[PDB]
mmCIF file of C-alpha atoms and ligand atoms in Angstrom:
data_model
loop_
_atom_site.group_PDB
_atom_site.id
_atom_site.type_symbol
_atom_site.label_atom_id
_atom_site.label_comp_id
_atom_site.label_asym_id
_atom_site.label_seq_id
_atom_site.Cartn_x
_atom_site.Cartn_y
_atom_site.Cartn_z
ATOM 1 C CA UNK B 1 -1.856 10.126 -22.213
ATOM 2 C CA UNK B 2 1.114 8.487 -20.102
ATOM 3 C CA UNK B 3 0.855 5.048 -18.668
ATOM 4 C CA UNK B 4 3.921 2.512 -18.619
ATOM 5 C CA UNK B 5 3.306 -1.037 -16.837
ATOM 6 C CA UNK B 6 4.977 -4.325 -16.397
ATOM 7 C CA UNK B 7 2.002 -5.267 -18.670
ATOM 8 C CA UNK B 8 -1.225 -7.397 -18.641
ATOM 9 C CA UNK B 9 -1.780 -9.196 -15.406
ATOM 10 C CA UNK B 10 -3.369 -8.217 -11.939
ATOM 11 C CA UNK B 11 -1.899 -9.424 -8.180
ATOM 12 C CA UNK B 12 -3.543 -11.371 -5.443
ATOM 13 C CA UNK B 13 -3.346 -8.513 -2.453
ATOM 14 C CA UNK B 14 -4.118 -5.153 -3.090
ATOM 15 C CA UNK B 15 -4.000 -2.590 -0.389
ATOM 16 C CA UNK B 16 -7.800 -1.925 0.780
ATOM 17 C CA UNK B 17 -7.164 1.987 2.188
ATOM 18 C CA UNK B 18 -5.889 3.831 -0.784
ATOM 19 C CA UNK B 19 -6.074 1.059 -4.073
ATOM 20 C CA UNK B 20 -2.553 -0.137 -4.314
ATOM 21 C CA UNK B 21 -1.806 -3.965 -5.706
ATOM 22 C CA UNK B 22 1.393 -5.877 -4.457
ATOM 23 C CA UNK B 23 2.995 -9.032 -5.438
ATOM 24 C CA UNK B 24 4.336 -10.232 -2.019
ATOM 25 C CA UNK B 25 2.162 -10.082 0.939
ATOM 26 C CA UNK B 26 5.436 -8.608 3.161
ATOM 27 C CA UNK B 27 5.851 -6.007 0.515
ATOM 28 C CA UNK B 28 1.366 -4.677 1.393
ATOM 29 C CA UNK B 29 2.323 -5.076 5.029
ATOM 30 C CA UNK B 30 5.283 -2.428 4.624
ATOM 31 C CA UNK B 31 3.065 0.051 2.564
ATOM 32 C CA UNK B 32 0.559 0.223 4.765
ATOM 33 C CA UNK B 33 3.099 1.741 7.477
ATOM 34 C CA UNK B 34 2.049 4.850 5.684
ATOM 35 C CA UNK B 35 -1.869 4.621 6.650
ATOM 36 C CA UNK B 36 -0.705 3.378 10.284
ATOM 37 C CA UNK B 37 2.386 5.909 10.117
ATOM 38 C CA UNK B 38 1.501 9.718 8.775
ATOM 39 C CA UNK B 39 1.877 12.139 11.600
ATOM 40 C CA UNK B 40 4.039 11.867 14.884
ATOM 41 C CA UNK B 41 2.267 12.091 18.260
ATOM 42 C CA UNK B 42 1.007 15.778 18.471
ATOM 43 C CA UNK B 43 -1.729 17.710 18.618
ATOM 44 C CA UNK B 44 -2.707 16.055 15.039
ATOM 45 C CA UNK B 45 -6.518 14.030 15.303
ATOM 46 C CA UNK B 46 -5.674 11.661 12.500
HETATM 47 ZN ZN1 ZN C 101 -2.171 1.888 0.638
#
């Protein structure tokens, strides 16, 4: 296997859509402009 981390240790918010953890609160808020951002306004239903 393949897995390289900053280490031991977990963080205090962690993204509740897909099961990503971030340090900073601002830094969740701008990842989740990928759940709330994905597709322009077409004929896409989400
Ligand atoms: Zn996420």
């Amino acid at each position: 296997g393949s897995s390289g981390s900053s280490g031991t240790g977990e963080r205090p918010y962690i993204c509740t859509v897909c099961g990503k953890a971030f340090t900073d609160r601002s830094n969740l808020i701008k990842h989740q402009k990928i759940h709330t951002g994905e597709k322009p306004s077409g004929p896409s239903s989400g």
